[PDB]
Symmetry: D2
């Protein structure tokens, strides 16, 4: 049985050892160390070779990465981009803001602010607040100018070439169009990583589709085909892992997909929600076990924390140390 | 300036005076009192008489529901339909007290499943392994037997068959709201929220309607009877036009997530809601939309700068029935 | 097994029935109904007559009421006053602010404000913020004028009459001095309900003792005797119940006292804390069971909510309906 | 204006660059970066040379500790001493990097008990009944065998005997801080926070020192050896004078409760702290002092209006070691 003991700074600042010490520090530091172990187990399983019996290359473990939209507003956008760039995860799930703001960041930046800035004076200057971040309205003007010709082409392809659009197919197209290596969705489509977002209309992309539909009516986004697509990613996996940042639709959609295989083998939740309100967001991993979304023999972990603090540290201690195994 | 003073139980127990005293008790009790005031302001504006032409509003919004002097959007996370708040919401919809509903997929399907089989009380700490081994699914401190979903399957599959047939031969272009209206008509049960919503021409928006058991069933059904399409674009047009052609709007939002953003973003299209009450347990510090204060929404234009929005930081299962008791339920004589 | 079902407003607004329906509404409404049941069980046990074998009158169950200081800033001060006035609880525990602000409210009121008011402009006008409440600085001036002559007498009594002051003895004296039926501590001392507050110096009372000690040095407040006094309240009880609003010292001090009898028989927590940070505040009742602070056979309840919303409703459904049993 | 940008792992893993990138990552990562800046400002001011007279400051504050150019108050809730943050705090005290400690009683006693027996890792969900039946006590996801407290009893009772004897025949008037200094000297172990605090003349305030196991032991001891008195009034004088006669003050407060208010209220006596960092998981909505934002303290005069205080909303077991790594631990050459 393992003793509580924190990092001793009389050793100097040995960063790897400082991070390794979270495991024996207690409370959420210990859960962070457990999450490192769960993700490294996902990775080790993924890198094992496939048996006989056992367009994206299939691996020995399929990793679903989910994140709420605000994390793409944050600099965790870079963290996610890196993982997608190097084919370290296999399926992305995010809400609509998490798609559009990645693209918009290729046209204009987001800025630091404070949570307490007052909306009246912000609105008067055309500045929109996302937590302690700030997005000028002009950013969305630029998005409009960029996106509208693409909506024109998608409608034409729908009506003259038989294309049946879904959120994931639109997201791949937008990633191809943005054509920018800073963009998560550019790498996702380049690497054949599907992106699911069933409420893709809930955001600025929706605004633009809405306005567009009055000059160029008839665009259809079907969510049924995308439900088949995400569920089959789980059903035909040798192994699955879930890494879920935040809650809401993203968290349920990944977990429910994995119910179709009688549960994920590995699971890490990082979120700030709590169970007491009965929310899905705040449900503990053990709630998911009752449904079959996480296997009974799994050892899932939740870290109760803002992912903007934890996720880059998690990546540093897991994926980033196995980078070579993921290249060329 | 208003003094802090709690209810004095030397008066005995008058529950109305007790709830009214929330306003001067402080902290979230005070915000509850402010929320009562904001909702009563919405209702008061809604009940003012109107004079507008019936044909152009139906053409612009593509809806059969008459305009009133204030359009009220009610949103709730799915789990509140698992709870007994389902009865609270059903009452409001039954009496045409709100005008637009927004909920995630679970908030649709579990209202229907409750007409087939009940949900039970449990505890948050019940272990998943033993529950799974007995076919019991946990929702917070509630429990749903798996057999409930089997009954749901049997009820729903013939309806999905008809929907595909209507799509392919009668030109129907399904969306979530149109499906939700049809499911409410089929369930044909006065305990159901969506039975009343469709009967009263109250639309229900749920853009991620595949994220739950209804999705499971659509998925399974599609391998027996392929082809169903659910378009979210037309439903975006429908919700936004409800805000655009409103004379006045109020937002009452229980919980966060999709529901909260979808209602607020629709109201951006009219440069902001006139009244807004949030009841949710989220906090701002994580940058989340769920946890964003009303004043964040003001920066975007989702809430008018001149509005007096209120957030109550609390579990809505505690607060929403009390809020309805002090607002809509006092005005039911006007609502008929 | 009990079905989920909310109050049906087609019945009209039947307030008692609306409150009774919280039990079957789920999430924290259900925990509220459970708390009503636990408190009513405390009360029923307290009102049972004492056996042969089995200055405050001893009853069949000793109820400890704890609350954080801010709840006395709130209007829950009236709720607590009522219970103390009618001898419905037996021991009070609160932090220092929870003593002084009760007294100050007899000299000048507290006002409603908002959480977002900015401290600079408040400080410039001599207005102090407590959450969404406001206390003018003048309130504390009035407190100073009222309190200083009492500190003079306590020192004199210490040095010439052998008095050994403790927090609970000072609180009883201050309640006698305030001589005002709106005050919690007036009723507490009148009804021989002891009040424990081991960090009594942490607040305005401390400020005043601090300043006083420079003109009239030597006042001693011993916390050891007060530890014996609260622990013996638990040790020699036939039965104990704990009703704890908020966390911190108050929650631990009551629970630790009841460890000395191998645990409380009944327990209700109402607080907004969560367990994930390892805090005592956020510890669930079942953590206390591991120490022996709550008996293994007890059925404790936590309601996760702001007590300013819940506690008056709890009192309405429990103590207030048994008022007759507590009088004359 | 500063752009949002996360650390780019195409650079490889440079942990310093990774922590520095917190500042531009947003949400609480940004507040962490601001907290690093505030603490480094405190340290920088502390290390400025001073010229003040040694005798009058010792007379006014009744302390042997020399004044520096900034007095840093470090507060932490008890559970952080249960955690491995105990080692973080011990390092700071060992090297005289902070000037005043404030903690609740558990934060005193468990530092001493850890020199006698360890605390172990467990899980939050372990059931109390089975733990109680095996003499294991739960602290969050940590576990303390009851035997740890038996060892504590045996170590402490002879010390309590000496304290009573010194009170009754050598005129000693015990207070919490004076007791804590004596316990640190007796534990005589370089792993102990309070061993280092007393050796370096860093006072420790804990006005409710009876609320925990030390209280249990004082209680039991008093029926064998009556008479110990612990006065909190003189300790109020001692902490307040540390603020009053400071040239500059900074507050670093982990958690809420007594600790947070006691430090901030001491700093009111000088019309406010110059620097302040809160790290805690509390929220404002419940009116709590724990959850009060720094700007509430500004309204009282506890934080100067010209200061730039920062709160990081997070479990300090995650954040405090990183904060120390980026601040105090980089400056240890100056601190010798
Ligand atoms: N919860 C269910 O019963 C259920 C059923 C089937 C599917 N799902 C799916 O789960 C997904 C996520 O659900 P969601 O985003 O709609 O909500 P959620 O349950 O994830 O809640 C989002 C946030 O809303 C707030 N909230 C939740 N419950 C609250 C309460 N009782 N009082 C106040 N505030 C509260 C909280 O801040 C919470 O983090 C949806 O797509 C849904 O279809 C859930
Ligand atoms: N930037 C934005 O936030 C943004 C922009 C456009 C649209 N939207 C829309 O808002 C709607 C709702 O968003 P949602 O459900 O995706 O997420 P959300 O922001 O509401 O968050 C849901 C829950 O996830 C958790 N969470 C959030 N941020 C976290 C963090 N940093 N660390 C840990 N946990 C965290 C919290 O418990 C929160 O209650 C969407 O449909 C989305 O498209 C958001
Ligand atoms: N916790 C223990 O191990 C322990 C041991 C013996 C006695 N006690 C007694 O319990 C009483 C109450 O403890 P308290 O008021 O000092 O603290 P607490 O544990 O009650 O915490 C108070 C608040 O501080 C904040 N906090 C706690 N842990 C945090 C963390 N890890 N990171 C950030 N913020 C955090 C939270 O908002 C919390 O509600 C004290 O009198 C103490 O002596 C506790
Ligand atoms: N008005 C004041 O708050 C005030 C005034 C003077 C002094 N002080 C001092 O502040 C110090 C710390 O206060 P504390 O530990 O007593 O309490 P606190 O206010 O810090 O609260 C401790 C915890 O109790 C819970 N809590 C608080 N308010 C709640 C509510 N309304 N509903 C439910 N739960 C709630 C929260 O989890 C909170 O973290 C004291 O020693 C006190 O004397 C406070």
């Amino acid at each position: 049985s393992t003793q509580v003991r924190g990092y001793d700074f009389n050793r100097g600042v040995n960063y790897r050892a400082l991070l390794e010490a979270f495991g024996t520090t207690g409370f959420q530091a210990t859960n962070f160390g457990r999450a490192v172990q769960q993700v490294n187990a996902m990775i080790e399983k993924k890198l094992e070779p496939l048996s006989q019996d056992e367009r994206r290359p299939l691996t020995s473990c399929t990793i679903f990465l989910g994140y709420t939209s605000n994390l793409i507003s944050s600099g965790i956008r870079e963290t996610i981009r890196y993982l997608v760039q190097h084919n370290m995860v296999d399926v992305l799930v995010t809400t609509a803001g998490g798609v559009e703001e990645d693209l918009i960041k290729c046209l204009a930046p987001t800025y630091l602010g404070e949570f307490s800035l007052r909306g009246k004076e912000l609105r008067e200057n055309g500045i929109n607040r996302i937590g302690n971040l700030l997005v000028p309205s002009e950013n969305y003007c630029k998005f409009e100018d960029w996106l509208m010709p693409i909506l024109d082409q998608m409608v034409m392809e729908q009506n003259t070439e038989g294309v049946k659009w879904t959120p994931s197919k639109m997201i791949a197209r937008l990633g191809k169009e943005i054509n920018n290596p800073e963009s998560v969705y550019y790498w996702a489509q380049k690497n054949h990583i599907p992106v699911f977002s069933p409420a893709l209309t809930d955001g600025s992309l929706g605004d633009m589709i809405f306005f567009h539909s009055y000059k160029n009516p008839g665009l259809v986004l079907d969510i049924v085909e995308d439900l088949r697509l995400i569920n089959t990613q789980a059903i035909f996996a040798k192994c699955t892992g879930m890494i879920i940042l935040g809650g809401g639709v993203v968290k349920h959609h990944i977990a429910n997909a994995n119910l179709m295989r009688n549960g994920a083998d590995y699971a890490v939740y990082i979120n700030t929600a709590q169970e007491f309100d009965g929310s899905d967001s705040g449900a503990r991993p053990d709630e998911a076990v009752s449904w079959g979304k996480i296997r009974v023999d799994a050892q899932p972990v939740k870290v109760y924390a803002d992912a903007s603090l934890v996720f880059p540290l998690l990546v540093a201690e897991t994926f980033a140390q196995k980078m070579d195994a993921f290249m060329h």
